[PDB]
Each structure stands twice: as structure tokens, then as C-alpha cells.
Write a protein that binds this ligand. Sequence first.
Ligand SMILES: O=C(O)[C@H](Cc1ccccc1)CC(O)(O)C[N+](=O)[O-]
Ligand SMILES: O=C(O)[C@H](Cc1ccccc1)CC(O)(O)C[N+](=O)[O-]
Ligand SMILES: O=C(O)[C@H](Cc1ccccc1)CC(O)(O)C[N+](=O)[O-]
Ligand SMILES: [Zn+2]
Ligand SMILES: [Zn+2]
Ligand SMILES: [Zn+2]
Lengths: 307, 307, 307
Amino acid sequence: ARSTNTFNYATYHTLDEIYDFMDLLVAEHPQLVSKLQIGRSYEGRPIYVLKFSTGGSNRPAIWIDLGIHSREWITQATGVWFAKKFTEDYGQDPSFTAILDSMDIFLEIVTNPDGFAFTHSQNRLWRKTRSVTSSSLCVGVDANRNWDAGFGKAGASSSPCSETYHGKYANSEVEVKSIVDFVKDHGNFKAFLSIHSYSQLLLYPYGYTTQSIPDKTELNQVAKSAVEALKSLYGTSYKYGSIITTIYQASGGSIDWSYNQGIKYSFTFELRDTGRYGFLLPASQIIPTAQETWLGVLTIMEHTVNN
Amino acid sequence: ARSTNTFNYATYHTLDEIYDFMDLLVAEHPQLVSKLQIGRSYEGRPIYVLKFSTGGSNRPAIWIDLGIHSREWITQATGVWFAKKFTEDYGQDPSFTAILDSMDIFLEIVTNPDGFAFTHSQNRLWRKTRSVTSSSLCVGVDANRNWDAGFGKAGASSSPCSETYHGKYANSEVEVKSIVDFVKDHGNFKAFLSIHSYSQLLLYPYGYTTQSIPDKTELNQVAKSAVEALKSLYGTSYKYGSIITTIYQASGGSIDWSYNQGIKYSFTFELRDTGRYGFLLPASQIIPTAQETWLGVLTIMEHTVNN
Amino acid sequence: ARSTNTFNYATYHTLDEIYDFMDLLVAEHPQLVSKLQIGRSYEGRPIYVLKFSTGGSNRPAIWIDLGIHSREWITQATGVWFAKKFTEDYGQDPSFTAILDSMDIFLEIVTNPDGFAFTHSQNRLWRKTRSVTSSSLCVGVDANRNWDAGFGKAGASSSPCSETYHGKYANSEVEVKSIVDFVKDHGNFKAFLSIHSYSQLLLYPYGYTTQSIPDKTELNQVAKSAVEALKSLYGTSYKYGSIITTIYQASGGSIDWSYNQGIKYSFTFELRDTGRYGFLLPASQIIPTAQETWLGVLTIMEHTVNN
Ligand SMILES: O=C(O)[C@H](Cc1ccccc1)CC(O)(O)C[N+](=O)[O-]
Ligand SMILES: O=C(O)[C@H](Cc1ccccc1)CC(O)(O)C[N+](=O)[O-]
Ligand SMILES: O=C(O)[C@H](Cc1ccccc1)CC(O)(O)C[N+](=O)[O-]
Ligand SMILES: [Zn+2]
Ligand SMILES: [Zn+2]
Ligand SMILES: [Zn+2]
């Protein structure tokens, strides 16, 4: 595709195609989008974040990371769609235009590029990073159990060979540390959304502890409204609540870390399909999934701009 | 450097320094080395191939190209080291001497001279050529996606601005066509090796198709022996296999083209570092990388001379 | 015959006559038909596929293979009639024209050329390939038990001398691997039809397992519609259903592999006669069989283009 207008949003793409997509979008919308490299993956691949801004100096921001678990293909596909949608709706949709006129959005489409490349090359269901560390045959860490929020506690595995291995220590994975450094340096993030796939859930803070967050009432209602908005499009039903009470105890998670940094609107989305196809969600559902999910994300952004 | 004996092999050099190196070597070893200009780059720079021969008439040959991707500096540096090594070992090492007594070696140290100059003056990470298309303000083509082997198929970009742009048509880039005309004219090449950088892999034919080559078993055995020889020096671990099964589908590749020309021993090396430094490999690793890679290349040459 | 217009479609032909037929058709309809060589048989004979296309780039396609079992002569004869039929009906029959204006059809008339030549020269009832086994005096493999779908499981024999020998490993037979690679590389096939002879059956996915396919309801109805269309011409009755529930458990089959690749409309046809003549079907039945079978095939293609 020589234009984001010829890019096939209804099909799954490779790392190269998505990175090329990034440059096309920036070339096509230079006053709105820019490409930032926040680090290099374990295998040296550049880690890219698309910044959507209409100006200002470090305006309140919204963080959105997708594909931290490589096999969750619907997320990277949705991230690409999100990127295009932002450029299409700014100056067209009153609400989204208002958000971007006062806030910046940072979108990381492929948070785990080495694993993504691997899902295309050797194993479609690979989910961890591709780091090799100590005296262990196995490879990779579950990057979403590597964050410094209840790191190493129940809800993660200490076995390097486990699919939910948390890594040697908090932030050991460069893919995670790169985000931590960017967000802490920025210092003005108001929302932090992590997109994952399948189970159709919208969860808020703490998977590592049963302690209720100080903002439970508000985040719970924001989640309720977001799920209803998402549902209004195709009838896709999502369940919502805190991570630990909704799915299970899970430690070292991204939104527990961001919420503890003071980023109030921290939520994690588990996208489409409740198991019919699971991680192998048909390409025919990419656009519909992205469209409905957008409604839920926009709902959250709206609460962030007015609060 | 006034002599190839004073040339600093442990540091990265410029195009001028490498070209001057070629003349020093030819002047020092007239009966063994000659400099051939197989064409001119897009920007008019001469394209040089060092020919190592001990006589004969169009003897079976071995082709070795390095630096087709300009930013992969470890390859041009290794290419220079190789040239020097050939002159030191011929007549001394039993095996290499036997190889050059029945075969010629054609070494192209800087296959993409325009890109190389660009990496020194404007962008250290530039990889494509410097050709200027017509309907785009972007520059260059991925020379290793421009060959007439599955040209234009999945595994390359049709967008001129892409880092993996395949170009207008097969062999559009003069840097590629120059090699194609040279090899076709010669008509007696038995080996074709393309040297690239980082990921530590030794790959054989077909990145453009899942079809296994008719000589898969043999090339796989050769690759296995070559990686073990390379590993024997410093313990550097290389993985091997076909391009598509090891990495991913990639079209317009050089060894896919050479193999389809009837050149059985077609391999591509992806040199040192698995991502720690990536393309910015420290100069302190030049000599060790060249040394170990040499063992692997020699292994391939040996299987070519006895078969 | 110097023209496909004088070609005798009511008689059985040799490999050479069919191959010459292909060239005549291509010469007469260059804008619609092209001949592709997708590989070489065990004994080195070219393996040809006729591509019918009105343009486009990698358009959704329909695959049709015939003669994988050499003695099933009615299939190759039907393949020849099919090829001619497509060139006569495009631009004449609204439905077929619509199919070709949006889709490509790939037709392999003689999937097992070595065996075909053998049925003409040595054994009219030979059905396997002609590959030579290392430690065995027996020759050939049952190409339709060599596919990577339940390969080696119940429903095939591991004995080289058996008429249903599955071979050393999945895809061991180049006649099978050639199709696999082509279809995999293409990546946009929507239907995969394999044509065999006698029993008068139309079967859908899974002969190796009793597991019901996710698309059983749709394929079953499509099958019902296809058999009704086929019967409507001469009253030929066909039975339909899954391979395992209709005939018997059979592993390594073509449509089990194609369906598992994501090609929804995968069906296998067992043509005319329920046993009176068996494999030795009279030439006088070639055209009537081809005509009625076409209606069934067209029916499937129609469902493929609208879904
Ligand atoms: O617990 C996990 O690792 C996630 C679910 C999740 C998501 C966010 C916070 C805590 C848990 C599962 C998944 O989304 O990665 C899907 N999966 O690859 O099993
Ligand atoms: O796919 C590529 O373009 C190469 C790897 C490669 C090398 C040979 C044949 C097929 C692929 C990557 C590289 O060696 O050029 C390093 N890079 O990404 O600049
Ligand atoms: O099992 C076979 O070999 C086929 C029947 C068949 C056909 C398709 C998928 C599974 C089985 C019988 C035949 O069509 O090959 C006729 N024959 O016995 O040569
Ligand atoms: Zn996940
Ligand atoms: Zn390279
Ligand atoms: Zn059959």
C-alpha cells in the first residue's frame, strides 16, 4: 500500500507492513502525527509510538498500548485501525476533535515486536517476549507480568519455561522498561489503556491485590458506560470490573503499575470472541472489532478530558 | 594506510579508504588479485569486484557480495578483512590453496556504494540504494528485494517510501543488474554468497516461496557444517535453514535468483549480534566476526570444490 | 487436431495429447488462459496447471485437481472438457461470466502424470505415483493419502507394496507438494475441488476424523444443491456427506488438508458409474459425465463467489 487509503484494514499484517503504515500516516498527516522511537526490543528492533497532537507543550495525555502479547493479533490490527481513525475523525467528529484539541494521544501498536515477528515466522500462538537470560533453555517473558506492581507475587510464574513467566526482576524486559521510562519522563498522562485479546472484558486496577482502588466508584461507572457504548454497535457483550475479581489474581500487570503512578483512568481491554476462535480471530472481524472498541475507548477519553 | 599491512582492520572505514585499499592489495599481489569494474552506481560511482585467480580459463567460480544493505557496516569491514585473508592464506593453507587452484573467487566488498557514502555523511542507518524514482519524493530501493526471483510478490513493499521497497521492476537497480549481467556472462559460478548483518543466521534458497529446493538436504548439511566451523572459534551461535522457514517470506532476494540460475551453493549470512548493538556493532568486534565468518565461508567453498 | 474446435472430447487421450491440448487452448484464448508449470513429477515430467483469469492481482481463486489417481481416466477426460467449457461460456453464461470477472480458476488436468503414462503403457489400473522406495521392490504412493492432514493415521497403509500406501512422510510425493506450495504461496483460494472416479459421491471435509467441521451445515447444503444440479441433466444420482461417514475413515486426503488451510469450500467428487464399468468407463460416457459434473461444480463456484 502506497497510501493509508490503500492499506487493507480487513486483513492481518506483518511487522514490516505495520511499520511502513506508520510512515505513510505521518507523511500524510504531518501536523497531527509523529513517530517516536522509545527504545529497542531485545532483538534490536525499534520500538515505535505514534504521537497524535495538535500542539501545546506536553498536554495531558492518553496512553494506549497494544500487542504486548504477540499472538493477540486482533489488537495490533485494531491499533492500525485506531491510528487511521484518529486522522479521519479529527475535525470531523465534534467529540474526538475536542479531545485532540486539548490532549495528546500516544499509541503503541506493536509493544512486543520480537514476539510479533515470531508469530509470523515460527509460532502463531507465541505470547511472550524473545529474551534469553540465565541458565535456562526456554525463552521469553510474559511482558504483562513484568511490571513493577506486585512483581513476583501470586498471579505469575517463576519458571522461565512457563507461558506466564514474570522474568528475573521488575522491568527486566526492555519492552516494558521503555514504556515505564517514557511515561515517567512525560509526567502528564491522565489515561493508560492496555489492549489485549479475547474474553471480552474491560477491567480496572489491581489484579495483584484484593485491595479496592480509591477511585473504584468512578472507574466502575466509566467501565459500565464504555461497555454499553461498545455494545451499541454490534451487540458485543463485555463484562467489567477489577482484574482480580473478574478473571483472577494476576501480578506485575501494566494497569496496576500505571494506576499506582497516579494515572487515574487505567483500564485493560480483552477484545473479541469468547472462545469461538480465540486468538485466531477471523480477519473478517478486524474492522467490526476495531469500530466497536473505538466507541468504548472514546467513552473513556471523554471522561478523561472532563475530569 | 600506505600498505595493506598498515591498514586498520579493527575500525570502520569510508568508501574512499576501502577503494584505496583495493588498489594497495592489487599492487601488492598482482599475480593473484585484480580489480574489475562491473558497472556504475545510480550516482555514477564505480562498482568494484576483486577477482582472485591463479590462472585457468573461466574456471568454476565463487561469488561473494557484501554491503548490499549500506547500514550493515560489519559486512563491508568483513569484506575488507576477507580480501586481505585470501592473499595471506593462498599458498600457505592447504585447503584454501586447493580451492584457488581450481576455482576463482569474485569478491564485491561494497555492493551498494551510494548507500554506503550516505551512511557516512547523512544517515548511519540508511539501507536502500539512492536511486530517485519518478512519481515519488522518497529515495532508494531495497536492493535485495529487487532481484528477478519472485519479484513483486509477498515479502516486499510496493511503496517507494518503504524500507523494503522492491523497486519499479526486476533488476531496475543498476547495482543489481550489474551483478546479474556479470554472473550471467561468466556462466560458470558454482557458489553465490550474500553477506548481511545481525541475527546470526546462515540461510539457503527461497524466501519468496514455500517450495523446498531440490537440493535442500545437501544445502542443509552444508549449512550445518558451516555453522559449526564458525562456532568453533568463539562460540558464536548461528541458526540455519531456508529463508522462509527460518525468518519469513521475502521476495526479490539475491540467492533465490542465483539458485534459480543453476548456482547450487547459494547462501546468505546474517552476521553478528542478536540485537545488543544491532547494526551499530562495535568496531572491537570486526576482526573476531570476520575471523569466525571466514571459517564458515571456507567450509562452503570446500563443499563446492569437492562437489 | 490443430484446434481445440476439432479436438475429440468423446475419446480418451494420452499425456502428450492432453499437454498439446493445453497449448492449443492457450494459443486460441491468450487473454483468458495461461499454462503454469508448478513442478516436475518424480520421473521429471512437467506438472501443468491451466489458469483462467480475466485480470486482477491474486484474485480469490478456485482450485480443481483431477487425475491424482491415474486409472480414473474419466477425470482427466472431464478436465479437458472443463477447460474448453470455460472458454466457451465466459461471455455467454451470465453466472459463469460473473464468477470469472471476480475470480480465478486453476485447473490441473493430470495431477499424476507418471502414473497416467503408466496406465497407457504398462498397467491400465495403476493408481499410485511412480516414486521408487529405498528398501522395497514395490513402486509408488497413493498421492491422495500423502497430504498433511491426519497423515499416517488409520485410513491408509504404511506398507510400500499396498495400493493405499501413504508414503514416507506427509508431502513426500512431489505431485502433492507442488500443489501445497502453489496454494500456500497464493494464499487466496476460496474453494478446493478434487475430482476422482466412480461411486457417484460428493463429499466434504474429514475422512481422517469423525470430528464434524465448523462449516458442516453450509457445506452439506451446498453439496445437496450441487448433486441436485448434477442430477437435473441426465438423472444421475449422487450421494453426499462427509468422507468418513459416507465411504470410510481415510487419512492424508487432499480436502482435509485444504479445509485445514482455511479453504472453506473443499469438496471431493467421485464420478460416474457405481460399478458396472468402474474405472473402465466407456468413452461414450465422457461428455455426458463432464456436462452433468460441470453443473455441480458451477453450483459450488456460485456459492463461493457470494460468500
Ligand atoms: O492474564 C493474562 O496474561 C491476560 C489477561 C489479563 C489482561 C490484563 C491484566 C491481567 C490479565 C491473558 C491474555 O489477555 O494475555 C490472553 N492470553 O494470551 O492468555
Ligand atoms: O530481510 C532482509 O531484508 C534481511 C534478511 C534477509 C537476508 C537474506 C535473504 C532474505 C532476508 C535483513 C537485513 O539483513 O537486511 C538486515 N536489515 O533488516 O537491514
Ligand atoms: O479412498 C480413495 O482412494 C478414493 C475414495 C476417496 C476419495 C476422496 C477422499 C477419500 C477417499 C477411491 C478412489 O476415488 O481413489 C477410487 N479408487 O479406489 O482408485
Ligand atoms: Zn494479553
Ligand atoms: Zn542485509
Ligand atoms: Zn481417486
